[PDB]
Design a protein around this ligand. Structure first.
Ligand SMILES: *B(O)c1ccc(C)c(OCc2ccccc2)c1
Length: 566
């Protein structure tokens, strides 16, 4: 990231700290939890609203020392009152702006926000799980401020969970108790805390909605898939992701040795010896070297992250993913709660910055063989069958005789988001009680209000609605500002928080009380539908057939001779 954007960011960080101070009030409050009393504080917003804030509520023991890489442990209760008037640190990660490692192993906290601690009615509880490819992210209000949602009468909860190798190391040897998915197990424990404590904050424990974007959507989907969470919540929203996205899981059991060897491990590839070395390493050393773990071959085959959610090699008490996600869909309790899913109208624009530094990626579209789903592709991607499958992809996205950068990013929209969504819907339809699933398409484009991901994707002055552009209209961030009440951005904020709050409340995202939705008839998807309908969210709200449908069917056609793997 440029020095200009670095200094720009440092300043906004300095501005955030002062604005945070200025929007703090002297009205502190104490709430009960099952682990003890917590002290919160009332905060203000730039729109002259206010909310009660509890940050730094632990839901697990700090996963340090002998607990590194292990499933989370219930936290120790306290006598007296715990200070929750400040946030804790984020999980150890590379700061995308600075390039330096930041955060802490001591990161298993959540934050609780509401405009009223003693509401007349038990309120809907909305639980946000952040994305960041399971390797970055936080619940800090500089990125995920509740300032917009607290205009609504709900309780909003933002969780953290372990990232990177510290969250997702996985070792085959059963004796070592490192099966993988520690970070997902973190989420499970936070959800359990939420179920048992939201009532203390005005929440209705019988009306909880879990939602997340990108890896947070994959996370939400995992929480709907695993038996560990059966009946814990009542609606789910998957924003630009789910568990069967190719980036959402990986078999990484062999990569722990590689990481160790990157960090100076001397010895043999043995799970016990590799673990012992990894247990003593500085956590910042491991996280910084994570970028080097994937092989050239793995990158070529579109493995995006070395460590992430995995199929656990053996079962344990807290096991979250005993089988591949496709399999877990067959029996998933979450198939039977109201569900909303969606994507932006140009997801793949997110990969602009990556394409810039690696222009040759565009030549992958010559045959598109590298984008053929890995389960269908041969190892070298040289089989004539793989060339045939790649030709189907090529026909779907290459518009001229030579592929362009926009063809690449259009392709990415489907490989990473739209096609996995299609597969999920079709799979789920064969295993559901009949609860509704609604689709949205976020198609609102502005650069008058942005979020820091625009900086990371190098999308300043860039047109189209990228992966993460919707976050701007759900959460306050330190790059935001007060918008005029009549502006299209402000209207979109009210629309997005409105629909999300309507869906969380009733399991149905339609309400006549939301501006622009007067002529909207938002029906869910049925198994018999050959064409998906979605609410296209733009300056106007309009129900349309998913424009991406034709391309989606073209991807599906690669599976013509392998229907059992679709
Ligand atoms: B969603 O959580 C997500 C989807 C796809 C990608 C590539 C992704 O990467 C985020 C990231 C990239 C580079 C460095 C740090 C984070 C996230």
């Amino acid at each position: 990231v440029s020095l200009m954007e670095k200094l720009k960011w440092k300043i906004k960080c300095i501005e955030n700290k002062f604005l945070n101070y200025r929007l703090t009030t002297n009205e502190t409050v104490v709430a009960e939890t099952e682990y003890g009393k917590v002290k919160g504080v009332k905060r203000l917003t730039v729109y002259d609203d206010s909310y009660y804030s509890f940050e730094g509520i632990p839901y697990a023991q700090p996963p340090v020392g002998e607990l590194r890489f292990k499933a989370p442990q219930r936290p120790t209760p306290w006598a007296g009152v715990r200070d929750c008037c400040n946030h804790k640190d984020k999980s150890v990660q590379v700061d995308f702006i600075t390039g330096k490692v930041c955060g802490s192993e001591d990161c298993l906290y959540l934050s609780v926000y509401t405009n009223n601690l003693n509401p007349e009615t038990k309120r809907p509880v909305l639980v946000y799980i952040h994305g960041g490819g399971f390797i970055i992210g936080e619940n800090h209000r500089d990125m995920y401020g509740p300032d917009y949602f607290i205009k609504k009468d709900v309780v909003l909860i933002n969780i953290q969970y372990r990232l990177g190798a510290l969250g997702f190391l996985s070792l085959n040897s059963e004796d070592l108790n490192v099966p993988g998915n520690a970070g997902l197990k973190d989420q499970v424990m936070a959800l359990r805390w939420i179920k048992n404590n939201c009532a203390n904050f005005g929440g209705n424990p019988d009306n909880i909605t879990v939602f997340g974007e990108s890896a947070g959507a994959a996370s939400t989907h995992y929480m709907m898939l695993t038996e560990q969470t059966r009946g814990l919540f009542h609606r789910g929203i998957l924003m630009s992701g789910n568990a069967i996205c190719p980036w959402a899981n990986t078999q990484c059991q062999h990569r722990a040795f590689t990481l160790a060897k990157l960090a100076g491990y001397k010895g043999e590839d043995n799970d016990k010896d590799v673990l012992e070395f990894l247990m003593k390493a500085k956590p910042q050393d491991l996280i910084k070297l994570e970028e080097k773990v994937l092989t050239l071959e793995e990158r070529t085959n579109k493995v995006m992250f070395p460590f992430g959610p995995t199929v656990e090699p053996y079962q344990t008490a807290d096991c979250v993913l005993p089988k591949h996600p496709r399999e877990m869909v067959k029996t998933a309790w979450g198939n039977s709660i109201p569900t909303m899913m969606g994507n932006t109208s140009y997801e793949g624009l997110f990969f602009t910055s990556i394409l810039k530094q690696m222009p040759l990626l565009v030549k992958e579209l010559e045959t598109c063989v590298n984008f053929v789903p890995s389960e269908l592709a041969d190892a070298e991607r040289t089989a004539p069958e793989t060339l045939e499958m790649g030709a189907k992809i090529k026909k779907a996205h290459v518009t001229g005789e030579t592929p362009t950068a926009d063809n690449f990013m259009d392709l990415c929209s489907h490989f990473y988001f739209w096609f996995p969504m299609h597969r999920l819907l079709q799979l789920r339809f064969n295993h559901t009680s009949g609860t509704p699933v609604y689709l949205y398409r976020f198609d609102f484009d502005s650069e008058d209000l942005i979020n820091p991901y625009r900086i990371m994707r190098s999308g300043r002055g860039v047109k189209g609605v990228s992966h993460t552009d919707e976050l701007t209209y759900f959460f306050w961030n330190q790059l935001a500002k007060r918008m005029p009440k009549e502006s299209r951005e402000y209207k979109t904020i009210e629309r997005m928080t409105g629909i999300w709050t309507q869906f969380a409340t009733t399991g149905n995202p339609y309400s006549n009380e939301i501006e622009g939705m007067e002529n909207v008839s938002w029906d869910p998807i049925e198994k018999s539908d050959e064409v998906y309908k979605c609410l296209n969210i733009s300056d106007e709200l309009k129900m349309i057939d998913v424009p991406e449908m034709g391309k989606i069917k073209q991807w599906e056609s690669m599976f013509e001779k392998h229907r059992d793997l679709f």
